Amino acid sequence: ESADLRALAKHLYDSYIKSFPLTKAKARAILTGKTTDKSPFVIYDMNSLMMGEDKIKFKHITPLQEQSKEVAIRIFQGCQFRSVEAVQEITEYAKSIPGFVNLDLNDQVTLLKYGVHEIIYTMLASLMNKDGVLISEGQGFMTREFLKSLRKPFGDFMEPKFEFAVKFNALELDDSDLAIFIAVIILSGDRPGLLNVKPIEDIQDNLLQALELQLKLNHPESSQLFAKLLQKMTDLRQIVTEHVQLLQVIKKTETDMSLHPLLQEIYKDL
Amino acid sequence: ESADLRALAKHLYDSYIKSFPLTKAKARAILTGKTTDKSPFVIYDMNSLMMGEDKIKFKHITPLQEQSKEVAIRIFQGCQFRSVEAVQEITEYAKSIPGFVNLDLNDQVTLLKYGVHEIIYTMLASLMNKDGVLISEGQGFMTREFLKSLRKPFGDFMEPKFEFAVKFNALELDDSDLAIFIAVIILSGDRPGLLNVKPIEDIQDNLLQALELQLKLNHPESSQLFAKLLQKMTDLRQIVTEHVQLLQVIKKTETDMSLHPLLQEIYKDL
Ligand SMILES: O=C(O)[C@H](Cc1ccccc1)Oc1ccc(Cc2ccccc2)cc1
């Protein structure tokens, strides 16, 4: 019954709105869009980052570049702090998906553990355009150039996400569409270690059904949009795999430090 | 008009039968012992192997292998042969996909280059069950266990293909379904280096519509089969990537062995 599907879609949208502060609609207004009423601080250079990190609402380290903590490192570690926040927002959203809390607890943890990275990059694209990505709740904007000019190991960290974003954003999905897509990603079914795959696939089946109707009604002229979005799931997987890769490579840069115990703890691997 | 999509489905199924000598229909009839009009000889150890060249057409070695191209080598030299053969069969099929031959020559080559191995693993599943795979046009059957017991590097080649096969086969697709799915794979558009992406996406869109109708009519009770099939496209990409690194390992261990020219061209790093 299209009734239930349309109902499911609205529910996910409302839940999505309350779990994620920065929506794509908002990010878009700020980005390429005009909506010039409070332009974001732009970070396009070392001086920009420096002469602005003290003026921006960032919570970690202050701008200090002179043989004391490399810029690239501080920026990378900065993305970790934010990803850790996103994880909690995503976890809260997952709990609103009909049926999720009723699943085996271990399976719930497994789905979140393997789905968080794919969701993070999916939503990150909402805050990106070909020229840069929004930062700090949208109060900042770090250029694509400045990021690619960072240290050798770190100058290739965001590029692949930028490439994905450009292609993903070409589908012109809106929040209402994304709310359902993100739920499909969470209720995968092929994650390793799952104990009871049936209820998970049963829910995804219902979610996919809802996603298809949402796309047909919200994008009547976009032929086969459903199929195209689903194929983007292969691009996300590669982004993630490729990501843990550069991560291990970085692991061979910073290691033994008797001052990171409690801090390194808060930031595991995911 | 669904009428035009049905005609396209028929066309592709027709060309598929004409290009691929060993269909899934024939493979299942051979595998399901219920049909013993012509059963396969089974290879599950060295002795069976020796006896294999007896009744089966094996131009390889039968006796000793250690000091004369070991078994593992003989088997993969044979595998290399079938793949090149498979590539030629797929290339022949590609030309029948409406619009393919009318594309920029450079793009035709790029589409085949990236799509060929994804198709091979899809079709290779038609020849597999949880315990082994048909060989030599169905005259033989080599055990999964036998293959996994080969020399350190050679024993890791097939296992992931079997793992893929067992799950892909759970979808219960038949030849008419696969003919359209294979065509969908070839006309990607997100392949690296494409010159004219639009004409490619226009063809894939039409093929996707054809695939969706086919699965709805041929599998009326298989909810979200279309979406489930499309997601399998992520498993294929992974298999290709692992396969490549294994290949790079062999190239360094067997400095006397050679990767066939046609396959060397298709492959590349990164
Ligand atoms: O990579 C390929 O194109 C083929 C693809 C394939 C793999 C499994 C079944 C069918 C086709 O699989 C190969 C795997 C290893 C090798 C290594 C090899 C090189 C020279 C001689 C013997 C083996 C060659 C092909």
What single string gives the DSSP state of each residue in A116-181? HHHHHHHHHHHTEETTEEEEGGGTEEEEHHHHHTS-TTTTTSSHHHHHHHHHHHTT---HHHHHHH
Six-digit token pair at B192?
A: 């690296």
The residue whose C-alpha atom lies closest to atom 10 belonging to ligand 1 is: B83
CA-closest candidate to residue B182, choices B13, B57, B69, B7: B13
CA-closest candidate to residue A127, choices A90, A175, A92: A175
Q: Does A234 sit within 8 Å of B233, measured CB to CB?
A: yes
B223 CB neighbours in chain A (<8 A) are 205, 209
Q: Which residues contact B135 (CB under 8 A, 6 or more apart)?
A: B43, B56, B78, B82, B141, B142
Q: Indicate which technique resolved this structure.
A: X-ray
What CA–CA distance (Å, rounded) separates A186 from A194? 13
Q: Scan for tokens 């701008």, then name that residue.
A: A63
* Resolution of this entry, Å: 2.1
What CA–CA distance (Å, rounded) separates A121 from A236? 7
Comparing alpha-carbon positions, the chain A residue that sits nearest to B190 is A167
Six-digit token pair at B74?
A: 């003989």
- Coil, strand or helix: which one is B41? strand
Q: Is B237 on the interface with A (CB under 8 A)?
A: yes
Count Cβ atoms below 10 Å from residue B8 Cβ, excluding itself: 20
In terms of phi and psi (left: phi > 0; alpha: psi -120 to 50; beta: otherwise), the region of A24 is: alpha
Comparing alpha-carbon positions, the chain A residue that sits nearest to B223 is A205
Q: What's the B79 CA to ligand 1 centre distance in angstroms?
A: 5
What CA–CA distance (Å, rounded) separates B151 from B266? 26
- Coil, strand or helix: which one is B66? coil
B213 CB neighbours in chain A (<8 A) are none
Q: Does B205 sit within 8 Å of A231, measured CB to CB?
A: no
Q: Scan for tokens 């690619």, then name that residue.
A: A148
In terms of phi and psi (left: phi > 0; alpha: psi -120 to 50; beta: otherwise), the region of B89 is: alpha
Which H or E run contains B72? helix B71-96
Count Cβ atoms below 10 Å from residue A57 Cβ, excluding itself: 10
Q: Does B233 sit within 8 Å of A237, measured CB to CB?
A: no
CA torsion sign for A163, A246, A189, A3 is: negative
What CA–CA distance (Å, rounded) separates B135 from B79? 9
Interface of B with A in 134-193 (CB under 8 A): 167, 190
What CA–CA distance (Å, rounded) separates A210 from A50? 47
Q: Which residues pair with B140 in a beta bridge?
A: B41, B135
User: Residue B28 corresponds to which amino acid?
Assistant: R
CA-closest candidate to residue B188, choices B177, B170, B180, B200: B200
Q: Is B223 on the interface with A (CB under 8 A)?
A: yes
What CA–CA distance (Å, rounded) separates B246 from B242? 6
Q: Mind telling me how many Å the CA of A232 is from chain B's nearest CA?
A: 9
Least CB–CB distance from B230: residue in A205, A209, A227:
A227
User: Residue B257 corresponds to which amino acid?
Assistant: M
User: Residue B169 corresponds to which amino acid?
Assistant: N
In this structure, CATH architecture of domain B1-270: Orthogonal Bundle (1.10)
Q: Mind telling me how many Å the CA of B240 is from chain A's nearest CA?
A: 12
Comparing alpha-carbon positions, the chain B residue that sits nearest to A210 is B224
Beta-sheet pairing, B41-43 with B140-143? parallel
What CA–CA distance (Å, rounded) separates A34 from A56? 21
What CA–CA distance (Å, rounded) separates B168 from B211? 16
Q: How far is CA B110 from the centre of its chain?
A: 18
